[PDB]
Amino acid sequence: NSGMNPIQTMTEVRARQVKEMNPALGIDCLHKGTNDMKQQHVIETLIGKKQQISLATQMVRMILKIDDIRKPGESEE
Amino acid sequence: LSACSFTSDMQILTASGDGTCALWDVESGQLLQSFHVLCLDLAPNTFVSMVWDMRSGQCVQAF
């Protein structure tokens, strides 16, 4: 969405996160020069991320568990 | 198939909505030459659909 190359930027940020232990390195969407989100003050609630992961996992589990559909197929008006 | 004007019984002129008439012969059964259609009138070695010539395989008179 910010116009940068996805795979290269994500790989570089992941490599930087692995090299020096800093879980605050993200994608410089606004092109401020730095990749440290702690300095850029990009902050989200922990509850938000936990809820995102939980809800996505549960809904994906439901969608994966459905193996049959019985629609009326009437194409009613 | 639209036009199947059997001809000189040695040759067969056939045509359809394809738009390119085909010249066949009875004995050999080989397409002699496909001239690049609804009517296949012959000479009242030449025929008109555009007049075509057997000897050259090309349109000779357009009207």
């Binding site: - | 040695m10 012969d25 004995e27 050999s28 080989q30 002699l32 030459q33 050259s56 395989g57």
Partner: protein, 526 residues
């Protein structure tokens, strides 16, 4: 009062007319739509289009050729029809440039609608465009370089031109191999312009790199039953005779006797006439016999008993190509054996290509006729390769005819546009604005070329403009990495004829469409 907007109606049911603003809107919309469609297939990084026929056959066609794309589309906009006819005529005149001329015309008409919106009379635009076309044409002619005197430099120019022509097409995967292929095929013509002397055979299966130019010739016909399947030091006789129950051409003649014994005698006389004809043919001292028409069973048996190959039903193109490649004479009477020249080749045999058997002529005498075998993975790939080779051969033949060459990669467009801008800076009035719009379209051409590659077109075009204004007359786009460079060293060259024709045809069509202020449509049949 308008013709249609009047209290009384003056038209039949279904007839229509569009006045100045509406006609201009329709024409500009149609032309810009055509230009946008045909573009993005331009330059080395242009992509291909899929043409799904809606007919009964539902023919599928993938291609990069602008003329092919514009031909097989249902067009209702009349200005779009004008542009399509422009592309077709450009294809007929020279092989390449079909996409470039259409894009140039579309950009010119877009600038024209901008100028009209700026309250400029279209006649002033036309005059300014005429002056700009004159200046650009003279500048391009001054920029042309000729290498026809030097054989090695001319061969290098042919290499570069074939490579530039094949760069955009699907053959860019094996550009080097296909460039050598096309250059050899054209050079084997010995200066003749007969593009029909080069036969392209499309055989499914195999890789695209397996395509090759046969050192001799290949015929897709069959040999007789009892005739030999292999001849060394062949003596060709090419004929266009009956060889099939050839009735005496007196159509009013008939056999009228009173006994079946006489009928049998006449039948034996007919067979003896055929036998004597075959003997007269054999008196030439030949090993192979190619006839344009069919050969029936009796002459075939006689030829087999004589140990002579009798290739039958080789159509007009086939006999012409055989005559060109072997040096024979297409005869129709055999009463003067000494006055007829016989073709020659070292070996004739049958070759196995894919699953079909073909006749191979090897060690030909003249060889002024080529057979190019195309192997591909799909029918669509084979068709596109055939189209690309046709474009390359056409451009190479045009270059052989006229050896003047100009640099590609946007260099010619930059130089012509720089000349147009220089002229405009010396011109007072709105003609200067029209000239500037003309130059803007000329810049827009390589701008679209760079856009298709994903590069930063604005910076590259600005650099090209600065270099051309400074005096670097050979600067152009370097598509290898996305910079600008010298087109002379990089060997990006194209025919002067092609570029001049593109420029002139685009200017003509833009002027013709711009002159229109009213479109009147008669009631259609449907």
């Amino acid at each position: 009062a308008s013709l249609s907007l009047a209290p009384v109606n003056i038209f039949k049911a279904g007839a229509d007319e569009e006045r100045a603003e509406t006609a201009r809107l329709t024409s500009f919309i149609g032309a810009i739509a055509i230009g946008d469609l045909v573009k993005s297939t331009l330059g080395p990084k242009g992509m291909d289009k899929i043409l799904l026929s809606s007919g009964r056959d539902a023919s599928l066609m993938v291609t990069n050729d602008g003329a092919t794309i514009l031909k097989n589309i249902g067009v209702d906009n009349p200005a779009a029809k004008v542009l399509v006819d422009m592309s077709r005529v450009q294809d007929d005149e020279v092989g390449d440039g079909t996409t470039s001329v259409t894009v140039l015309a579309a950009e010119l008409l877009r600038e024209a609608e901008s100028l009209i919106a700026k309250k400029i009379h279209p006649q002033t635009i036309i005059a300014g465009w005429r002056e700009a076309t004159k200046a650009a044409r003279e500048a391009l002619l001054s920029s042309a370089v000729d290498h026809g005197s030097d054989e090695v430099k001319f061969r290098q120019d042919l290499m570069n031109i074939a490579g530039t022509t094949l760069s955009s097409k699907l053959l860019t995967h094996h550009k080097d191999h296909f460039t050598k292929l096309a250059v050899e095929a054209v050079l084997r013509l010995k200066g003749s312009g007969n593009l029909e002397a080069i036969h392209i055979i499309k055989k499914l299966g195999g890789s695209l790199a397996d395509s090759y130019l046969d050192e001799g010739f290949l015929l897709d016909k069959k040999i007789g039953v009892n005739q030999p399947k292999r001849i060394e030091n062949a003596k060709i006789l090419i004929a266009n005779t009956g060889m099939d129950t050839d009735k005496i051409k007196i159509f009013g003649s008939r056999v009228r006797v009173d006994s079946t014994a006489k009928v049998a005698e006449i039948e034996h006389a007919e067979k003896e006439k055929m036998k004597e004809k075959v003997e007269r043919i054999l008196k030439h001292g030949i090993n192979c016999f190619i006839n344009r028409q069919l050969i029936y069973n009796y002459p075939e048996q006689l030829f087999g008993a004589a140990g002579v190959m009798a290739i039958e039903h080789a159509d007009f193109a086939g006999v012409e190509r055989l005559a060109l490649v072997t040096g024979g004479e297409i005869a129709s009477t055999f009463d003067h054996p000494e006055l007829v020249k016989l073709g020659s080749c070292k070996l004739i045999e049958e070759v196995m290509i894919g699953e079909d058997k073909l006749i191979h002529f090897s060690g030909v005498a003249l060889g002024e006729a080529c057979t190019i075998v195309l192997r591909g993975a799909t029918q669509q790939i084979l068709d596109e390769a055939e189209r690309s080779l046709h474009d390359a051969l056409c451009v190479l033949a045009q270059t052989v005819k006229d050896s003047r060459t100009v640099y590609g990669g946007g260099c010619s467009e930059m130089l012509m546009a720089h000349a147009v801008t220089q002229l405009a800076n010396r011109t007072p009035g709105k003609e200067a604005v029209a000239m500037e719009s003309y130059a803007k379209a000329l810049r827009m051409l390589p701008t679209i070329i760079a856009d298709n590659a994903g590069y930063d077109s604005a910076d590259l075009v600005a650099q090209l403009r600065a270099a051309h204004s400074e005096g670097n007359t050979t600067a152009g786009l370097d598509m290898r990495e996305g910079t600008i460079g010298d087109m002379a060293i990089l060997g990006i060259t194209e025919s002067f004829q092609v570029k001049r024709q593109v420029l002139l045809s685009a200017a003509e069509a833009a002027e013709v469409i711009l002159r229109v202020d009213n479109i009147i449509k008669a009631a259609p049949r449907k």
